[PDB]
């Protein structure tokens, strides 16, 4: 599914994320537009040989399992196939995860390279939440 800007920033908060470990809602959705232009079926490969999945490009190397990422964890605990749902539920809970590891949001490298300092309550300006 593709959602749109403030429909995927309601169901973020619904599902948890505004100001989860302090980032404010924007950061989500900013960091979810450079990852998968809001696509809940994006899927790119690493040059390493790992994926990313979903919304917000989450990492085979670590994160799911895709049964093809030599020499990986899957630290969410859950099929890497479960990150493209049209339900947002299981990326929500394992970027939850990857937030809290001690990182912050830089795990993101998109949220670094383009949200990180910026006017990311843009992103969310306009909508009913
Ligand atoms: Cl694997
Ligand atoms: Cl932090
Ligand atoms: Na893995």
């Known amino acids: 599914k593709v959602f749109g800007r403030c429909e995927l920033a309601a169901a973020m908060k619904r599902h ?70 049209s339900d947002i539920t299981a990326s929500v809970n394992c970027a939850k995860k990857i937030v809290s590891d001690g990182n912050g949001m830089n795990a993101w490298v998109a949220w670094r390279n383009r949200c990180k300092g910026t006017d990311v309550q843009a992103w969310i300006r306009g909508c009913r939440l």
């Open 16 to 85: 948890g994320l505004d100001n989860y470990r302090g980032y404010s809602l924007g950061n989500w959705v900013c960091a979810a537009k450079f990852e998968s232009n809001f696509n809940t079926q994006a899927t790119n490969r690493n040059t390493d040989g790992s994926t990313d999945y979903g919304i917000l490009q989450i990492n085979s190397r670590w994160w799911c399992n895709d049964g093809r990422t030599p020499g990986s964890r899957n630290l969410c605990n859950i099929p890497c196939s479960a990150l493209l749902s």
